[PDB]
């Protein structure tokens, strides 16, 4: 069914399924800072799960398979959304409209400075390339389906999203050479987002906060191989 979609229908479907931008709870210690993020991330997780169901092809998977992809990709998905939100705010991370953080604020938590800089680097990289929302929703879906597939139907869908991405680039008036170059530039960034996710969960499953029973359940999925 998702295979029968057109590129425009694909984009439209993906845009319409976008989760809302949630607000944070209205200086920072290590506990409070961690408290705010955990709460925010816990709430976002609920919308991500509903967003996932509307990603063309995702409902076709067994429940076991759906759970697996979500367990692997959840932080990656949180991260690319953050990086995207912080698009028009250079030097800052926009966790929420009422929670705009910089480097120094990221030093409040042990080891978070390193990931902050990476997150900021990814943001400016998106800014430098003028990442469009249509491309963003395509990328985010790819993360969900690709992370982690090797952990056939999915690859048919992945090819479809690739088709969509190129279709968008051709629309924007890019030449063939500029098209594959930009495609490559975008997928290579996903490699870094994977990296940021892995280092992020390295710390996450060592920690103070209350931490949701759902959030610990997502974390427990990655502890199994620590």
């Amino acid at each position: 069914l998702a295979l029968s979609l057109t590129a425009d229908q694909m984009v439209s479907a993906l845009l319409d399924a976008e989760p809302p931008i949630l607000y944070s709870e209205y200086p920072f210690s290590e506990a409070s800072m961690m408290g705010l993020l955990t709460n925010l991330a816990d709430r976002e997780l609920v919308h991500m799960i509903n967003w996932a169901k509307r990603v063309p092809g995702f409902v076709d998977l067994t429940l076991h398979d759906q759970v697996h992809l979500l367990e692997c990709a959840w932080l990656e998905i949180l991260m690319i959304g953050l990086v995207w939100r912080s698009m028009e705010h250079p030097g800052k991370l926009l966790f929420a409209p009422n929670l705009l953080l910089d480097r120094n604020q990221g030093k409040c938590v042990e080891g978070m400075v390193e990931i902050f800089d990476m997150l900021l680097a990814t943001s400016s990289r998106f800014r430098m390339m003028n990442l469009q929302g249509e491309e963003f929703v395509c990328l985010k879906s790819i993360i969900l389906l690709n992370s982690g597939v090797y952990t056939d139907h999915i690859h048919r869908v992945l090819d479809k999203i690739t088709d969509t991405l190129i279709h968008l680039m051709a629309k924007a008036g890019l030449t063939l050479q500029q098209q594959h170059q930009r495609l490559a530039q975008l997928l290579l960034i996903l490699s870094h987002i994977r990296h940021m996710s892995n280092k992020g969960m390295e710390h996450l499953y060592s920690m103070v906060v209350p931490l949701s029973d759902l959030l610990l359940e997502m974390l427990d999925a990655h502890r199994l191989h620590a």
Binding site: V46, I49, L63, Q66, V67, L70, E71, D213, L214, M218
Partner: peptide, 10 residues
């Protein structure tokens, strides 16, 4: 799992 519930949830 709590994730099982939400994925079948309305």
């Amino acid at each position: 799992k709590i994730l099982h519930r939400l994925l079948q949830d309305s």
